[PDB]
Amino acid sequence: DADLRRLSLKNAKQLLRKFGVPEEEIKKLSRWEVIDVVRTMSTE
DNA sequence: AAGGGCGCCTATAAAAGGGGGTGGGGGCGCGTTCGTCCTCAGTCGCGATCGAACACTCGAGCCGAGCAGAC
C-alpha cells in the first residue's frame, strides 16, 4: 500500500492496463480509487 | 634647339603621442537545472457507538401436601 501509493498515478494506470482492469476505472483516473482498485486486483 | 645649374627622393638611428585595427579577454546577464520546502492526499490506527448475546431476576403456572368437611 505504501509502494502502491508511491506508484505516482501514471505507472498505476499502466499497471491497471496490464492486469486487465476495464477502461472506465482507468479512465476516471482518481488516484486514491486507482490505488485501492490495484490493491484489490493484487489481492485477487 | 641647346645650355645650363641644385632640391625631391631613397637610407640610418632615436624620442614623443596620434592615427588607424581587428582580435582577445574579461565581466555581466540570462537561462537552465537541481535542491529544498511546503502542501495535499492517502493510509493506518484509535476511539466511539451500536448491536447482539448471555445471564440473571421476576413472574406465572403446575404439582403436591395438608386440612377440613362430609358420609
From Swiss-Prot:
What's the entry's take on its domains? The Bromo domain mediates interaction with histones that have acetylated lysine residues at specific positions. The second domain also recognizes and binds histones that are butyrylated and crotonylated.
What's the family?
Answer: Belongs to the TAF1 family.
Q: What does this protein do?
A: The TFIID basal transcription factor complex plays a major role in the initiation of RNA polymerase II (Pol II)-dependent transcription. TFIID recognizes and binds promoters with or without a TATA box via its subunit TBP, a TATA-box-binding protein, and promotes assembly of the pre-initiation complex (PIC). The TFIID complex consists of TBP and TBP-associated factors (TAFs), including TAF1, TAF2, TAF3, TAF4, TAF5, TAF6, TAF7, TAF8, TAF9, TAF10, TAF11, TAF12 and TAF13. TAF1 is the largest component and core scaffold of the TFIID complex, involved in nucleating complex assembly.
Q: Which gene encodes it?
A: TAF1
Which disorder is recorded?
Dystonia 3, torsion, X-linked: An X-linked dystonia-parkinsonism disorder. Dystonia is defined by the presence of sustained involuntary muscle contractions, often leading to abnormal postures. DYT3 is characterized by severe progressive torsion dystonia followed by parkinsonism. It has a well-defined pathology of extensive neuronal loss and mosaic gliosis in the striatum (caudate nucleus and putamen) which appears to resemble that in Huntington disease.
Q: What is this protein called?
A: Transcription initiation factor TFIID subunit 1
SS bond partners: none
Organism phylogeny? Eukaryota, Metazoa, Chordata, Craniata, Vertebrata
Assembly, per entry: Component of the TFIID basal transcription factor complex, composed of TATA-box-binding protein TBP, and a number of TBP-associated factors (TAFs), including TAF1, TAF2, TAF3, TAF4, TAF5, TAF6, TAF7, TAF8, TAF9, TAF10, TAF11, TAF12 and TAF13. Interacts with TAF7; the interaction is direct. TAF1, when part of the TFIID complex, interacts with C-terminus of TP53. (Microbial infection) Interacts with SV40 Large T antigen.
PTM text: Phosphorylated by casein kinase II in vitro.
Where can this protein be found? Nucleus
Q: Which domain of life is it from?
A: Eukaryota
